[PDB]
Amino acid sequence: ERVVINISGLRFEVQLKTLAQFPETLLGDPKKRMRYFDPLRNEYFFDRNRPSFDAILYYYQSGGRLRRPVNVPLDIFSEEIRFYELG
Amino acid sequence: ERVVINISGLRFEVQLKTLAQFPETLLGDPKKRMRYFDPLRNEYFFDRNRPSFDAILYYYQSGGRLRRPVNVPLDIFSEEIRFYELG
Amino acid sequence: ERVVINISGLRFEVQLKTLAQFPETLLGDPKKRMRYFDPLRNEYFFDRNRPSFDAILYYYQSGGRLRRPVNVPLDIFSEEIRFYELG
């Protein structure tokens, strides 16, 4: 019912249903997120910016609220939003 | 003597006596927090915003001080305050 | 040669020598830190603010540089400095 998303060593735990709200995104589509699945550790691994992911995850948890963390510059966060295919 | 609270993968450890100071809150009421308990892991699980939780825990630690962290926007923090029933 | 310091669920790992450099403080004095030792998990446990502790630990690691994390208000951080007996 929940999966583990490991962002450069930082492990997040989220419900599958939470991710399923946005099926056109990377994490919302099983076919896209499967490219980052690590079958040996039973988790999805992303070699990316850690401080951005709290906000990416919150976008799903909140049902659509996208906010940039103060400590992540706009150009860096905008690249993460593009990578996670939230537009 | 200690309880584990897992906020989307991030684990917090707090004495039950400290939560018990505020019985009208979610975490201070046995009936309410039981809805989020996981017997296998012996922890409470919330699929919620991570940055906000340091200030939620500080509310219990400080004996009732409610302080918004500078990196958590006011509308987000106010929703977390209402969810955990700290008002 | 290393000890584990658990601040409300957040585990820090520090060389004993790093702490020993300031023997008049809580963590640098064997008798003061012993009050917070947990023989079950072989770690020191503090029911305190998490965001402050990176800075407290960095005071030892850097050989004496004490800086307040931008995300922790001055009154809260000053209370932590007193608790850890850094003066």
Added chain:
Amino acid sequence: ERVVINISGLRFEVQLKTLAQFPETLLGDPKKRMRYFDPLRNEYFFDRNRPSFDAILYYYQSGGRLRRPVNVPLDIFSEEIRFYELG
């Protein structure tokens, strides 16, 4: 093919190829990083500032972009840049 970097208890995970991009840095040089390796913990351990490391990692992830995080003071960050041999 992954490397675990433990900064005072905080674990970071990166692909070895990512560090390998910059062979003249501490983490990109096998001989230099070997001094910090722990065979019994298959990880490299640094007793250093935690908040600075997200930005050290982002230098490798970004293909060489060096960005001072907003809540890490310049003198502290500059010392970490020097220690990891990024310049």
